[PDB]
Design a protein around this ligand. Structure first.
Ligand code: HEM
Ligand code: HEM
Ligand code: HBI
Ligand code: HBI
Ligand code: ARG
Ligand code: ARG
Lengths: 361, 361
């Protein structure tokens, strides 16, 4: 009763806004009549390729926490609403990885899977990111952030070699099944980059490496009232995410003290700012490495610079700019970018991407 | 009518809270009766030395934007509510600088001047900070942030030598006067620190220097409904304020490109992260310099560390912790401190320090 109401309201708002940007303002009337009857007949409606394709772009545009929004209208939308089997999902996910990686020249993409019907999911992705390292304990081994999921995967028959860089398998659940299925990722499909330094040879002794493409797979894409709980998307990495966070946080890989060792500085006094010097060399190492292997990556200054350009375009287009200051600023040298020196309206506008409760844990 | 009401309400709240922390809970009743009659008789009330002394500490404790709050109960409170002349104010300000500096071993202090009576100020301080460099234009000369005030001072007969480090004079206005008076600061009273690097000799070619003690002089101290528009206070510097902001911001001294030059790195590509490397060396230079001249200063890691300890004590004391995440995180390596990894309630609690409209501009 109330669900059929919210749906209709969100649909009217989205079609109008969408068709207005698409230059199909006259087609709004006839399109809404079709949707009204569809919601009554079934209890939901089916987007057109053009609608979800542009709704996925708009959602990216409204992602307050994303710094790379300047490239919103270039998103490669892959429609996989025709998937029925676990093999279809697996192949789609394999396809996403292959096409997004694009031999290094990363292509920002998103694979749309069937959305929820009567609130129930058709495809449920468990993975945070399609490619991600596992985490274990006795003493820290791997990525701590992957612990709860690594345990869940292991409760399904999967076993990691217990190195710091074990690739978690693809784990998802189809409607009608009680437990998710899993598939080990084909290594030929996964690009990893060993981390080295341009001027410091000893850096390779740290034996650090990271994967090339971050593919957030556990967020909900909401478009015109339709909940696409499964819509894996990807951009390329901003070096800081790997160097100033993934390999730096005490709760993650905690490598700063070790970096200080190989670069030849002491860790005795904070006044020497060894952590800061360590972060700069670790981050330079990351940028130099990806570039060297031919994998797309962006430094935080270029990214902020591109994001400034984004803000201007939104002003030029007549749209209100929204953002989360605390996430837009890079973890390293935030005051060196314009983002630090201004404020952002952190209001939620749809369509968008949202967090959803994890099936495990 | 309404002013006499707000005053009474704020007073009841403060005395109770104050006397509770002071262990003088029984004296609350008798103290409030005296205040009630005082407000009726005159239209305001006079704090006791103990009250404003502790109210100034509490206010510091509630300063969401201050990272050095762990040292709140050690604040050296100087009561100068007996000042009547411009000479009294001038001497008090000279005294504050002398006693706070303390030959380098900076002493966190605050000089309390007469508060507002019927909304009107008795002493109006124009200076943002007691010691501060001037700013000019044709091309940038000095500190851009001091421009509007430098122009105002010059409209009063003062003239700067137009170097990048001209000391602004003390400028304030007494009740009853239309224009403020000014007094050049005695150099013997002002500690400045030339900036040098421990490992890079050429750094001195930049000829950078900064003053030792930051003394915010334009904030309002509100305690139990009493508005002390003039209450200059000071702590010591956190290196980042000078190196990652005062000398780094494009709108301030903009020295990063020049720092890159003296340390021997190129400014050609963002991927080399030259700004970050530049910031680290500039910041190390700052810390090493103050320490070398015997002037108190604190690095951002020690400060965050001290602030963590602060949060714990507030939990142990039973008090709610409040803070502004965007100001607590240091401009350099914020993710390396605990402040980055948590959230803070940015609610305003009194007593406190507030911004007030600038007389100039
Ligand atoms: C093209 C390159 C892209 C760059 C450089 C970029 C960069 C970023 C960065 C640095 C963050 C912060 C990540 C973190 O701190 O964990 C972020 C978050 C986000 N980005 Fe992107 N992004 C890109 C593409 C995309 C795409 C293709 C989409 C969606 C269609 C998108 C959606 C989002 C969203 C929803 C967030 C928030 C994620 C979260 O809360 O965990 N971004 N992006
Ligand atoms: C003892 C050493 C102290 C340290 C290390 C310290 C540090 C800081 C830092 C780093 C900031 C940010 C400044 C900026 O970004 O411009 C700040 C702000 C502030 N501090 Fe402190 N502080 C100290 C003492 C004090 C004292 C003595 C008081 C007051 C009695 C105080 C009151 C405040 C207030 C109100 C702010 C906000 C200032 C503004 O908005 O411009 N702090 N403090
Ligand atoms: C919530 C979390 O603990 C923390 O407050 C924030 N995390 C992040 C952040 N910034 C980015 N980009 N990514 C984060 O994960 N700033 C704030
Ligand atoms: C308001 C200003 O432009 C900016 O948003 C903020 N300034 C400061 C900041 N942090 C500190 N400590 N000091 C600032 O001046 N972060 C945010
Ligand atoms: N640039 C991006 N597309 N980032 C998406 C999130 C990546 C995540 N912060 C990571 O380091 O794994
Ligand atoms: N540590 C302090 N007490 N800082 C107070 C403000 C100083 C100001 N940010 C400056 O650099 O001049």
């Amino acid at each position: 009763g109330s669900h059929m109401e919210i749906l209709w309201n969100e649909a009217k708002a989205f079609i109008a806004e969408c068709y207005q940007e698409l230059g199909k303002e006259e087609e709004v009337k006839d399109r809404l009549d079709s949707i009204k009857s569809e919601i009554d007949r079934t209890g939901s409606y089916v987007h057109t390729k053009e609608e979800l394709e542009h709704g996925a772009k708009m959602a990216w545009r409204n992602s307050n926490r994303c710094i790379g929004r300047l490239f919103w209208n270039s998103l490669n939308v892959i429609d996989r609403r025709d998937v029925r089997t676990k093999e279809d999902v697996r192949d789609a996910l394999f396809h996403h990885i292959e096409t997004a990686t694009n031999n290094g020249k990363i292509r920002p993409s998103i694979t749309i899977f069937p959305p929820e019907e009567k609130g129930e999911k058709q495809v449920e992705i468990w993975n945070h990111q399609l490619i991600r390292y596992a985490g274990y304990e006795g003493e820290r081994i791997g990525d701590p952030a992957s612990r709860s999921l690594t345990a869940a995967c292991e409760q399904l028959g999967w076993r990691g070699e217990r190195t710091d860089f074990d690739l978690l398998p693809l784990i998802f659940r189809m409607r009608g099944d009680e437990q998710p299925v899993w598939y080990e990722l084909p290594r030929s499909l996964v690009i990893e980059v060993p981390i080295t330094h341009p001027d410091i040879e000893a850096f390779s002794d740290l034996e650090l490496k990271w994967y090339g493409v971050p593919i957030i797979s556990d967020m909900k894409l909401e478009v015109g009232g339709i909940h696409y709980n499964a819509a894996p998307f990807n951009g390329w990495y901003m070096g800081t995410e790997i160097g100033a966070r993934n390999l730096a946080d005490e709760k993650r890989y905690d490598k700063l003290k070790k970096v200080a060792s190989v670069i030849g500085i002491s860790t005795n006094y904070n006044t020497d700012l060894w952590k800061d010097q360590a972060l700069v060399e670790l981050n330079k190492a990351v940028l130099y490495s990806y570039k060297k292997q031919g994998v797309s990556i962006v430094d935080h200054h270029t990214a902020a610079s591109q994001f400034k350009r984004f803000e201007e375009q939104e002003e030029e287009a007549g749209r209100k700019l929204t953002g989360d200051w605390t996430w837009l600023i890079p973890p390293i040298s935030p005051a060196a970018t314009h983002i630090f020196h201004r404020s952002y309206d952190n209001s939620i506008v749809k369509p968008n991407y949202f967090y959803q409760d994890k099936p495990y844990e």
